[PDB]
């Protein structure tokens, strides 16, 4: 339908083109009176598509993808005029997206229902970092095309304020987080983690230490944060503790199954063997 | 159910549609 209009123009153009030899004026001038106005109506269609540069999408950045598609058009400094009028739609829908980002940040990480294997603090700092990165794209596309009008700078002011605030809040969470583990270990977790033993069942003593240091090393490695030597090594030791507790679990369950089969009969050849199967653990071996 | 199927364009014109998507790439260029 669009090429139909263009070809109608081309056809009446080429048919009016019978006047060149005697009248370059008549031919080309009338050809232009028709073709310029009809191709400018087709430019109004291209301008419906200049609005479509956004309308193809509900997002600024995809509108910018279409702007990047428009590269053959840069020869004419008339799209740039429509580009200049549209820079405002650019900035405004950018502002809409970041106002949504603002109401997102106002509902801090603790409010949404997160389902994963990341501690609250690592999830919080990583979600703040990801929001900062999501904001950075906009605040970087902002200048160098609309700096001239500075509306973009007016909005960059608030955006940079939000960025500094996010930096400060991340810093606060890190003050709550980074040395939290150092305090925990140096006070009650690095003072000779008591190995797991048994009186009637397996008594776990530092399951909290296990889970904590696991999550610590995992999230620090995933986010690319420096892991202290103390953290890394008490982690290796917790790996040892966990493997050994699993093995001792299996062994105790073996004794349990054997007793579950012995007691239905209560034979006085295996009951004394059961008694012989008793062992004693002194305090010296609780640090093996 | 009204949005079930269109039954003419989806079926055998779909390979042509993928060729048309590649055309839209040539257009992007």
């Amino acid at each position: 339908v669009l090429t139909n209009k263009f070809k109608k123009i081309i056809d009446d153009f080429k048919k009016k083109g019978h006047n060149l030899l005697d009248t370059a004026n008549n031919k080309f001038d009338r050809d232009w009176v028709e073709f310029n106005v009809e191709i400018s109506h087709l430019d109004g269609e291209l301008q419906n598509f200049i609005d479509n540069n956004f309308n193809r999408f509900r997002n600024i950045e995809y509108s910018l993808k279409l702007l990047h598609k428009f590269q053959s058009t840069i020869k004419r400094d008339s799209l740039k005029h429509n580009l200049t009028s549209r820079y405002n739609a650019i900035l405004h829908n950018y502002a809409t997206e970041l106002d949504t980002i603002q109401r997102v940040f106002q509902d801090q990480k603790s409010n949404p229902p997160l389902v994963r294997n990341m501690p609250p603090e690592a999830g919080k700092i990583i979600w703040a970092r990801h929001l900062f990165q999501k904001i950075t794209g906009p605040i970087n596309i902002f200048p160098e095309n609309v700096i001239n009008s500075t509306e973009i700078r007016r909005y960059y002011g608030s955006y940079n304020t939000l960025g500094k605030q996010l930096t400060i809040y991340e810093m606060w969470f890190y003050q709550d987080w980074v040395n939290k583990i150092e305090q925990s270990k140096a006070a009650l977790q690095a003072t000779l983690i008591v190995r797991h033993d048994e009186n009637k069942k397996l008594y776990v003593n530092f399951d909290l230490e296990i889970m904590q240091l696991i999550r610590e090393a995992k999230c620090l490695d995933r986010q690319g944060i420096e892991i202290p030597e103390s953290a890394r090594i008490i982690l290796l030791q917790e790996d040892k503790f966990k493997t050994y507790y699993n093995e001792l679990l299996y062994a105790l369950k073996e004794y349990e199954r054997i007793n579950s089969k012995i007691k239905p009969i209560c034979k006085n050849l295996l009951l004394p063997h059961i008694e012989d199967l008793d062992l004693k653990l002194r305090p010296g071996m609780v640090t093996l | 159910s009204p949005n079930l199927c269109k039954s003419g364009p989806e079926i055998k014109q779909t390979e042509d549609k993928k060729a048309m998507e590649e055309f839209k790439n040539v257009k992007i260029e």
Partner: protein, 51 residues
Amino acid sequence: TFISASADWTVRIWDSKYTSQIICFDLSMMVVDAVWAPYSSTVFACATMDK
């Protein structure tokens, strides 16, 4: 033909025969589940926030 969708809400028609994707299409909620419809139509669907 395959499809790949990013955290930046972008959907991508990876034609195995190509190194440059076909239709760099683009829409909010493209992080989340996407699917090809079990119809002859190449229907796409994204879904979050009861939407």
